[PDB]
Amino acid sequence: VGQQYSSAPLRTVKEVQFGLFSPEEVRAISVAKIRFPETMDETQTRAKIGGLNDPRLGSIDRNLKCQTCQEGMNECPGHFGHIDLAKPVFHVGFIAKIKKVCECVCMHCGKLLLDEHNELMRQALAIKDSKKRFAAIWTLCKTKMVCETDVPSEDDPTQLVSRGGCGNTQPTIRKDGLKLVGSWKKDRATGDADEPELRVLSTEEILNIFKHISVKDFTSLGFNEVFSRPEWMILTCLPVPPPPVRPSISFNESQRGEDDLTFKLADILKANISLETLEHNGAPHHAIEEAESLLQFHVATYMDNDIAGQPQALQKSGRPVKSIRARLKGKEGRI
Amino acid sequence: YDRKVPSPTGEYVKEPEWVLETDGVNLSEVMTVPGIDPTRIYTNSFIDIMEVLGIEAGRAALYKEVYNVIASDGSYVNYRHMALLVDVMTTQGGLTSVTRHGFNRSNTGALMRCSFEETVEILFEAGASAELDDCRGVSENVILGQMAPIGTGAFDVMI
Amino acid sequence: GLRFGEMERDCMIAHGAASFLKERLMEASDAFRVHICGICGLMTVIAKLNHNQFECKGCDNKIDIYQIHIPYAAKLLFQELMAMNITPRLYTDRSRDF
Amino acid sequence: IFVYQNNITPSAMKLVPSIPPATIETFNEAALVVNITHHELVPKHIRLSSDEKRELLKRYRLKESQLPRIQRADPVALYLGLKRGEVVKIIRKSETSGRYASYRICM
Amino acid sequence: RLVKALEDIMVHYDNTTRNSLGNVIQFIYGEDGMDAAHIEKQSLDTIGGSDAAFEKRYRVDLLNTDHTLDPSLLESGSEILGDLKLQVLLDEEYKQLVKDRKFLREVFVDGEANWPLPVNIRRIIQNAQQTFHIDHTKPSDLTIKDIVLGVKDLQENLLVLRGKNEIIQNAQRDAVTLFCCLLRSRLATRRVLQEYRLTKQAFDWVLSNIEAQFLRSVVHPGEM
Amino acid sequence: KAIPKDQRATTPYMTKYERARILGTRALQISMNAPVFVDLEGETDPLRIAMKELAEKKIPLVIRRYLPDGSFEDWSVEELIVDL
Ligand SMILES: [Zn+2]
Ligand SMILES: [Zn+2]
Ligand SMILES: [Zn+2]
Domain spans of chain F?
A: 1-84
Count of other CB atoms within 10 angstroms of residue A108: 14
Q: Which of A325, A302, A323, A230 is nearest to A22 (CA)?
A: A230
Residue A83 CB burial class (10 angstroms; 0-12, 13-18, ≥19): buried
Residue B4 and residue E110: Cβ atoms within 8 Å?
yes
Tell me, what DSSP letter sits at residue A238? P
Query: Any binding-site annotation on C11?
Result: no
Q: Which of B103, B74, B104, B69 is nearest to B85 (CA)?
A: B69
CATH number of C1-85: 3.90.1800.10
How many Cα atoms occupy the beta-carbon half-sphere of D70 within 13 Å?
Answer: 32
Domain that holds residue A176: 91-236
Experimental approach: X-ray
Query: Any binding-site annotation on A141?
Result: no
How many Cα atoms occupy the beta-carbon half-sphere of B133 within 13 Å?
Answer: 29
β-bridge pairing E114-118 and E39-43:
antiparallel
How far away, in angstroms, is C41 Cα from ligand 3 center?
7
CB C54, CB C62: distance < 8 Å:
yes
How far apart (Å, rounded) are the C-alpha atoms in residues E114 and E111? 9
Count of other CB atoms within 10 angstroms of residue A316: 10
Residues of E whose CB is below 8 A from D61: 14
CB C4, CB A38: distance < 8 Å:
no
Please give the torsion angle defined by the CA atoms of residues A46, A48, A52 and A56, in that order, rounded to the nearest 10 degrees.
150
CB E97, CB E162: distance < 8 Å:
no
Q: Of F24, F62, F66, which is closest to B158 when you measure between CB atoms?
A: F62
Paired with C71 in beta bridges are C31
Q: Which ligand is nearest to the CA of A108?
A: 2
CA of A129: which chain B residue's CA is closest?
B129
Q: Of D55, D63, D97, which is closest to E178 when you measure between CB atoms?
A: D97
Same domain, A227 and A246: no
Residues of A whose CB is below 8 A from C70: 13
Residue B143 and residue C16: Cβ atoms within 8 Å?
no
Domain end residue (candidates: A215, A236, A257): A236
Q: What phi and psi, each to the nearest 5 degrees, are found at residue C35?
A: -110, 125
Residues of F whose CB is below 8 A from C95: 1, 69-71
How far apart (Å, rounded) are the C-alpha atoms in residues A247 and E58? 85
Q: Which of D79, D87, D90 is nearest to D107 (CA)?
A: D87
Please give the torsion angle defined by the CA atoms of residues D57, D62, D68 and D74, in that order, rounded to the nearest 10 degrees.
50
How far apart (Å, rounded) are the C-alpha atoms in residues A46 and A49? 10
Helix (H, G, I), strand (E, B) or coil at E56: helix
Residues of E whose CB is below 8 A from D55: 166-167
How far apart (Å, rounded) are the C-alpha atoms in residues F19 and F65? 13
Q: Residue E116 belongs to what H/E stretch?
A: strand E114-118
E neighbour chains, 3+ CB pairs within 8 Å: B, C, D, F
Min CA distance, F54 vs chain E (Å)? 19
Q: Amino acid identity, residue F7? A: Q
The environment of the single-atom ion ligand 1, i.e. residues with CB closer than 5 A, is: A 66, 69, 76
How far away, in angstroms, is A17 Cα from ligand 3 center?
14
Q: Amino acid identity, residue B36? A: I
Residues 6+ away with beta carbon under 8 Å from E92: none
Q: What phi and psi, each to the nearest 5 degrees, are found at residue A201?
A: -75, 100
Q: Amino acid identity, residue B148? A: A
Query: Any binding-site annotation on C37?
Result: yes
Q: Which ligand is nearest to the CA of A74?
A: 1
Residue F15 and residue E218: Cβ atoms within 8 Å?
no
β-bridge pairing E10-11 and D99-106:
unpaired
CB A48, CB A39: distance < 8 Å:
yes
CB F63, CB F18: distance < 8 Å:
yes
What are the residues of chain C with a beta carbon less than 8 Å away from any beta carbon of chain E?
Answer: 10, 13-14, 16
Helix (H, G, I), strand (E, B) or coil at A19: strand
Q: Which of C86, C36, C34 is nearest to A244 (CA)?
A: C34
Q: Which of E199, E93, E78 is nearest to E152 (CA)?
A: E93
Same domain, A95 and A231: yes
Query: Any binding-site annotation on A104?
Result: no
Min CA distance, C91 vs chain F (Å)? 14
How far apart (Å, rounded) are the C-alpha atoms in residues A199 and A217? 26
CB A302, CB A267: distance < 8 Å:
yes
Residues 6+ away with beta carbon under 8 Å from E208: none
Q: Of E12, E215, E222, which is closest to F67 when you measure between CB atoms?
A: E12
* 3-state DSSP helix/strand/coil % of chain E, to nearest 5: 50, 10, 40
Residue C73 and residue A232: Cβ atoms within 8 Å?
no
Does any domain span residue A10? Answer: no
How far apart (Å, rounded) are the C-alpha atoms in residues B24 and D54? 46
E222 touches B at CB < 8 Å: yes
How many Cα atoms occupy the beta-carbon half-sphere of C8 within 13 Å?
Answer: 9
How far away, in angstroms, is A74 Cα from ligand 1 center?
9
A14 touches C at CB < 8 Å: yes
C29 touches A at CB < 8 Å: no
Residue A13 and residue B114: Cβ atoms within 8 Å?
no
How far away, in angstroms, is A232 Cα from ligand 3 center?
19
> Which overall architecture, per CATH, does domain F1-84 show?
Alpha-Beta Complex (3.90)
Query: Any binding-site annotation on A66?
Result: yes
Q: Which ligand is nearest to the CA of C47?
A: 1
F2 touches C at CB < 8 Å: no
In a mutagenesis test of the C interface, which of A7, A17, A322 is the best target, namely the one with the most C β-carbons within 10 Å? A17
Q: Which ligand is nearest to the CA of A70?
A: 1
Asked if the bond preceding A88 is cis, omega within 30° of 0, the reply is: no
Paired with C67 in beta bridges are A10, C35
CB A74, CB A247: distance < 8 Å:
no
Q: Which alpha helices (H) appear in chain E, and where do they start and end?
A: 2-6, 51-58, 84-107, 121-129, 144-157, 166-186, 189-190, 200-216
Residue F7 and residue E164: Cβ atoms within 8 Å?
yes
Phi-psi region of C55 (alpha: psi -120 to 50; beta: other; left: phi over 0): left
Residues of D whose CB is below 8 A from B55: 70-71, 74, 76, 104
Burial readout A189-212 (b: 16 or more C-beta within 10 A, e: otherwise): eeeeeeeeeeeebebebbeebbee
Min CA distance, C42 vs chain E (Å)? 25
- D5-14 long-range contacts, Cβ below 8 Å, gap at least 24? D5/D29
Query: Any binding-site annotation on A166?
Result: yes
D neighbour chains, 3+ CB pairs within 8 Å: B, E, F
Q: Residue A201 belongs to what H/E stretch?
A: strand A198-201
- D24-28 long-range contacts, Cβ below 8 Å, gap at least 24? D25/D1, D25/D78, D25/D81, D26/D1, D26/D2, D27/D1, D27/D2, D27/D3, D27/D78, D28/D3, D28/D4
How far apart (Å, rounded) are the C-alpha atoms in residues A112 and A216? 10
In a mutagenesis test of the E interface, which of B1, B39, B88, B157 is the best target, namely the one with the most E β-carbons within 10 Å? B88
Domain end residue (candidates: A186, A205, A236): A236
Paired with E218 in beta bridges are E34
Please give the torsion angle defined by the CA atoms of residues C7, C9, C13 and C14, in that order, rounded to the nearest 10 degrees.
30
Residue E26 and residue B84: Cβ atoms within 8 Å?
yes
Min CA distance, F78 vs chain C (Å)? 23
Q: Which ligand is nearest to the CA of A165?
A: 2
